[PDB]
Amino acid sequence: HKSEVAHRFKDLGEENFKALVLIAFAQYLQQCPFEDHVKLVNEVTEFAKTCVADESAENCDKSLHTLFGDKLCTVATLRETYGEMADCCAKQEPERNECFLQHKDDNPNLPRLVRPEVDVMCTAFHDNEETFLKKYLYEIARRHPYFYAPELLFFAKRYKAAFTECCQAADKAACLLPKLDELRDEGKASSAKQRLKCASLQKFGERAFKAWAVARLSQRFPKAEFAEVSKLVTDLTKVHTECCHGDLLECADDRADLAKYICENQDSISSKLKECCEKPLLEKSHCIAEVENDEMPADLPSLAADFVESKDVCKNYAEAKDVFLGMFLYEYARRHPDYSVVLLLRLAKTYETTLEKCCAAADPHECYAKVFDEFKPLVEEPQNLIKQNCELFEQLGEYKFQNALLVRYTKKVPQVSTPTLVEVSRNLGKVGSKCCKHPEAKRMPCAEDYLSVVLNQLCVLHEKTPVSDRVTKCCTESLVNRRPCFSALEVDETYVPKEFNAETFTFHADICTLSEKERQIKKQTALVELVKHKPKATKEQLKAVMDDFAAFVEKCCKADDKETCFAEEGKKLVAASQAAL
Numbered sequence: 001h002k003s004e005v006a007h008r009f010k011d012l013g014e015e016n017f018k019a020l021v022l023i024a025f026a027q028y029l030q031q032c033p034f035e036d037h038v039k040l041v042n043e044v045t046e047f048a049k050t051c052v053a054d055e056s057a058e059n060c061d062k063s064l065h066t067l068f069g070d071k072l073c074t075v076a077t078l079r080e081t082y083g084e085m086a087d088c089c090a091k092q093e094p095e096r097n098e099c100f101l102q103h104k105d106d107n108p109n110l111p112r113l114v115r116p117e118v119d120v121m122c123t124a125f126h127d128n129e130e131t132f133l134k135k136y137l138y139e140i141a142r143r144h145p146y147f148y149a150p151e152l153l154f155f156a157k158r159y160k161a162a163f164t165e166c167c168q169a170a171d172k173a174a175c176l177l178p179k180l181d182e183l184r185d186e187g188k189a190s191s192a193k194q195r196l197k198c199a200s201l202q203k204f205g206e207r208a209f210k211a212w213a214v215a216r217l218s219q220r221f222p223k224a225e226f227a228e229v230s231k232l233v234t235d236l237t238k239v240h241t242e243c244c245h246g247d248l249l250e251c252a253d254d255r256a257d258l259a260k261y262i263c264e265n266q267d268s269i270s271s272k273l274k275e276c277c278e279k280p281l282l283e284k285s286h287c288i289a290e291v292e293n294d295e296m297p298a299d300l301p302s303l304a305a306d307f308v309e310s311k312d313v314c315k316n317y318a319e320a321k322d323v324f325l326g327m328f329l330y331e332y333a334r335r336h337p338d339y340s341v342v343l344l345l346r347l348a349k350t351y352e353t354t355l356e357k358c359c360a361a362a363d364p365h366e367c368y369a370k371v372f373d374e375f376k377p378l379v380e381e382p383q384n385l386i387k388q389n390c391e392l393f394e395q396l397g398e399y400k401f402q403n404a405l406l407v408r409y410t411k412k413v414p415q416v417s418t419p420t421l422v423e424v425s426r427n428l429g430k431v432g433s434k435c436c437k438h439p440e441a442k443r444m445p446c447a448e449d450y451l452s453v454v455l456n457q458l459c460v461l462h463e464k465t466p467v468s469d470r471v472t473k474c475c476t477e478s479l480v481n482r483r484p485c486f487s488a489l490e491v492d493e494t495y496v497p498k499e500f501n502a503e504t505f506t507f508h509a510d511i512c513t514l515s516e517k518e519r520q521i522k523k524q525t526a527l528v529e530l531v532k533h534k535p536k537a538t539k540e541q542l543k544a545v546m547d548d549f550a551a552f553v554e555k556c557c558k559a560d561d562k563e564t565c566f567a568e569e570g571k572k573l574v575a576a577s578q579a580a581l
């Protein structure tokens with residue numbers, strides 16, 4: 001690699017190269033205009049083609065980090081706009097690159113990206129596809145400077161596909177808007193998972209991340225040997241450590257090296273990687289990360305022969321505790337793709353505790369005899385919660401299931417803001433809509449994937465604006481016991497009911513002109529305030545007020561003088577509700 005810019009240009013291709021260079025510089029110069037970044041991209045791309053033609057050409061021998069930092073230091077207004085970031089230019093490598101890393105500003109002060117009307121977007125898409133798409137790519141990247149650039153490119157290509165299909169359909173909005181919202185949720189969920197793994201790696205440590213990786217990788221590649229899984233776990237931990245640190249190119253090299261090793265050893269890993277390993281380097285690691293679990297060996301025995309019955313259990317444990325516990329996790333996880341990773345970790349921690357007490361006892365076999373009996377209640381707790389909640393989602397609709405969660409969680413923690421209580425309960429209802437359509441065998445991993453992002457969105461907002469010591473405890477405990485903590489939250493008996501406010505329970509004819517979303521949120525906001533004002537109301541008493549409110553809306557939205565109905569039949573509904581409650 002006399003020329004790494006030329007090797008990357010030949011590997012990625014011109015189109016991918018230009019997009020990734022745009023993202024990389026937009027994530028650093030997050031206050032520079034789009035037209036500046038375009039000239040920078042074209043200047044780097046033309047230089048790269050020079051090196052593709054002749055790798056011996058001037059500056060082609062330099063490292064990509066040196067070329068990136070050099071280009072950053074050619075911006076004429078670097079000190080005017082970014083201040084102390086420009087002082088990184090006085091340093092040399094590798095200190096300059098590290099200096100630029102620290103001054104990457106997460107949460108820039110930028111206005112929220114307003115989604116234009118579908119007709120405006122489709123017209124701009126048609127008349128100027130390149131500038132329309134790349135300007136949007138630039139607005140996303142400058143607002144999310146730590147989002148892994150290739151993954152942002154992967155989302156960006158799905159946005160382009162959505163615009164190509166729906167901008168030609170009959171009802172363009174009916175095609176595009178659900179697709180746009182789906183991509184937005186997918187992007188927020190990806191960013192949430194990434195920042196979760198990084199913060200957990202720092203707070204809880206490397207061993208906890210390794211235990212998580214053993215469980216997930218054993219579920220994914222059950223036909224692999226433990227030595228192969230442990231090798232992948234060690235590599236995956238180094239990958240995430242580097243990627244959490246923030247260097248895009250070092251993170252990309254580590255990821256590609258892992259995907260290369262996996263693709264050269266598919267025979268020892270899994271049988272479902274043939275396609276991902278034929279994909280280009282840009283997409284190889286992404287494909288492997290999302291590939292389905294391999295079918296497990298059907299000839300698998302019980303875990304009793306190696307972990308409770310046989311002698312040399314305490315001896316093998318003391319020889320290498322983490323390795324022995326890892327073997328337990330690998331064997332259990334490969335046999336259980338139906339379990340959440342955190343349940344597998346609860347079972348391994350249960351085994352660890354029991355082995356630590358029993359191996360210090362006179363006849364260890366005696367107290368480590370019935371430890372598989374201790375796994376039953378831990379397995380049943382999430383399974384029961386999923387079965388009952390998926391039954392509730394089938395009885396009611398998604399909306400009325402959201403309203404059930406609304407009353408439940410408002411009663412548990414009534415100090416939370418009404419906007420936050422509404423968004424959380426709405427999201428949790430969508431988790432039921434998607435995971436309860438899975439058979440029981442794939443429901444707990446489904447719930448874990450989505451509950452983790454809802455609970456981190458929750459725990460982030462609480463760190464910034466705290467309201468409950470109980471939520472602080474659940475959010476600061478291990479991620480293994482985060483969901484159980486929230487599940488064990490009980491109805492708050494210290495809550496003082498909020499005082500009545502007539503404006504909160506006064507409704508107008510604008511409710512009939514809103515769309516389903518705005519109407520539902522308006523009603524869901526009032527339901528939270530209803531429970532906050534009358535927290536001792538039963539679900540029967542609440543259903544009576546809700547049913548009355550529903551008839552009040554339907555009648556006054558169909559009346560001739562709609563506004564006075566909402567004012568006169570509204571003051572009747574309020575008074576009768578106050579009497580019943």
Ligand SMILES: CCCCCCCCCCCCCCCC(=O)O
Pocket residue numbers: 015016019113114115133134136137140156157159160180181184
């Ligand atoms: C290889 C180059 C691919 C082309 C790049 C495509 C970039 C598309 C970005 C579209 C973002 C749309 C965001 C709309 C607002 C929202 O829903 O939050």
Ligand SMILES: CCCCCCCCCCCCCCCC(=O)O
Pocket residue numbers: 204207208210211214229230233321322323325326327329345346348349352478479480
């Ligand atoms: C290839 C094995 C690497 C090392 C794996 C360590 C063995 C498992 C760790 C102890 C049991 C699980 C503990 C829960 C994790 C946590 O929340 O810290």
Ligand SMILES: CCCCCCCCCCCCCCCC(=O)O
Pocket residue numbers: 005008012020021024044064067068071150249252253255256259281282283284285286
């Ligand atoms: C001034 C020139 C600097 C070049 C900066 C842009 C280079 C982007 C690096 C390409 C990403 C590597 C491919 C993805 C690999 C993976 O994630 O497995």
Ligand SMILES: CCCCCCCCCCCCCCCC(=O)O
Pocket residue numbers: 340342343382385386389390428429431432435436443444446447448451483484
């Ligand atoms: C799939 C249904 C989700 C319904 C949303 C309401 C919350 C119910 C939680 C059900 C149990 C979740 C278990 C996740 C994995 C674990 O903690 O072991």
Ligand SMILES: CCCCCCCCCCCCCCCC(=O)O
Pocket residue numbers: 385409410413416420424457458459461462471483486487488
């Ligand atoms: C941002 C601060 C919010 C504080 C917490 C708000 C109260 C609602 C959260 C409860 C969700 C629990 C997740 C599923 C657990 C269960 O239902 O068993």
Ligand SMILES: CCCCCCCCCCCCCCCC(=O)O
Pocket residue numbers: 403505523524526527530533545546547549550573574577578581
């Ligand atoms: C006791 C104070 C005044 C109460 C007045 C009625 C308040 C009702 C607010 C909640 C309405 C929820 C609607 C249920 C489902 C639906 O029909 O969309």
Ligand SMILES: CC(C)[C@H](N)C(=O)O
Pocket residue numbers: 140144147152155183184187188191
């Ligand atoms: C980063 C995420 C929040 C963003 N909405 C996306 O499109 O990728």
Ligand SMILES: [Cl-]
Pocket residue numbers: 113184
């Ligand atoms: Cl957004």
Ligand SMILES: [Ru+3]
Pocket residue numbers: 184187188
């Ligand atoms: Ru977003």
